[PDB]
Design a protein around this ligand. Sequence first.
Ligand SMILES: CC1=C(/C=C/C(C)=C/C=C/C(C)=C\C=C\C=C(C)\C=C\C=C(C)\C=C\C2=C(C)CCCC2(C)C)C(C)(C)CCC1
Lengths: 154, 166, 165, 95
Amino acid sequence: DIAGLTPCKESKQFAKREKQALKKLQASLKLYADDSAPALAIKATMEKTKKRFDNYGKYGLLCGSDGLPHLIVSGDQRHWGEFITPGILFLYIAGWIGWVGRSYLIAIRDEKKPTQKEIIIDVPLASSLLFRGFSWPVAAYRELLNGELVDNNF
Amino acid sequence: LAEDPENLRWFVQAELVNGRWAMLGVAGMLLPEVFTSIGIINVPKWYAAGKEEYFASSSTLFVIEFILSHYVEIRRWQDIKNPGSVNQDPIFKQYSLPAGEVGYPGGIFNPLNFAPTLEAKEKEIANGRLMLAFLGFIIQHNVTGKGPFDNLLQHISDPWHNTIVQ
Amino acid sequence: SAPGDFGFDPLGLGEVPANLERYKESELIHCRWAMLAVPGILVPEALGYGQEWAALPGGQATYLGNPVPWGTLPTILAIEFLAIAFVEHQRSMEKDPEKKKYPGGAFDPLGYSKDPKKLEELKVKEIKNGRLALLAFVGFCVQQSAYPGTGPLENLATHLADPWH
Amino acid sequence: SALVISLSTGLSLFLGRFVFFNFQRENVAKQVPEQNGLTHFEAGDTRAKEYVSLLKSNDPVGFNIVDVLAWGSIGHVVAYYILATTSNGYDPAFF
Ligand SMILES: CC1=C(/C=C/C(C)=C/C=C/C(C)=C\C=C\C=C(C)\C=C\C=C(C)\C=C\C2=C(C)CCCC2(C)C)C(C)(C)CCC1
């Protein structure tokens, strides 16, 4: 809707892309597997990109010209989860990479000398620490701002 | 430099507030349930009231209730930093003024107390989780369908269903 | 929230309490000149009949010789600013604590001198009525600034609108 | 529409606030002192700022705007004329 022309429901330019291209990759008249059991353009690789179809999902999806899709990601119409849905996802996953970065680290410096523990890795992935990360509700999001890492630790 | 078990007034309060509202939410269903009666999101516009006026948009009923809700809600944040509620029932709860043991910082496990009566709401705590994570389930199962149970001569088996779309 | 509770002296205190605020107080009655064109509406079934110089149908006399550029608005205006600018000057210059000269020797002791030349003298109730005024011009007057064509011919059923807008 | 001489009226509001002091008190520019030759030395490098000298004119020369601005701009200004003009003078109204 926002400029790049509209979704699947009609994107001719998009249609023409579906067709030539793949459909021709077809257009090797045959090359022969009349029984034959191996060679897989034939089945899917097309059909897996091809039984892509007046359906794709549906997905809206903007299709500029040449009918390749453009992603607006505004908070509108159809398009919201082309950044946020897979955006908070990126955030959540990272940060539970480094929440445990700031963990199978702040667990040593200690006892009897710890000068390169780090290059062998008891327990690997920390693991133990690991799950801390999904079991963050809130986690750093208040504790980083108060106490522990605290302005004094600042 | 101080090692552990900080938290204090803190968010014991948060959970319990979840438990108490979760319990209420479940009551908001509850309603049909024996006379199967009415279902699901409903989006109701709630109970009604009976008509002279409406057609009903009639403004944003929620926005208003909610501005009011809002200085009850402050009252509580207040209390929690420095406390005054005559009953004094979450912060400790009743039996009140003590919880001293939390107030000066540092408890680490503590169980707690409450009420001039007795039986320590450890039994309200349960009735209270279940209702936590009961929404959890309840909300989850919409996506697909309204209803649970009663009878088998057919129902219990879950003989054919939808899936997720993929 | 200009204040929650910031703070400390002579400017916030000094320029800011006293005077921003006495100068906001000079404000409400003066707001009232404006609210006042408006009260002039404001009572129903009053008998305006008909001047009051609204909507530019032509002249103040006209004048003998031309009308001045075009219209009233500039005459009233130019003139008002020099007169009032003179008064903002009368506000300008005393001190409080005492005023003999451009005198050289009065810093503070303990304790503790003079309060904002005027401090409130009590009948800081004027202020409940005052804040309340700042709040209303703000907000409510704004409550119909925004799309404001029409006077009431009030319908039914209730009130408010929400989105919009 | 456009009150063009709304504002040229306007700007020689202020620079007549310039016709100022050349005339009155003392020799002019209050000196030079500092400008050629140069400053003590000074050497921050340096002075002079006073927040207090807004008084003197703001009341006296408030009038100046008017003098062309009034009756002289949109005046038929200096109508009260004639005064040696064979080669020519007038100067006749463009109004
Ligand atoms: C809505 C939106 C938007 C907006 C934006 C903005 C407005 C910006 C900004 C932002 C910002 C303003 C940022 C900053 C912040 C600050 C800070 C300060 C942060 C922080 C943090 C930290 C510190 C972290 C840490 C960590 C973690 C958490 C993980 C692990 C560990 C670590 C260490 C890594 C965008 C654009 C996106 C686009 C569209 C959408």
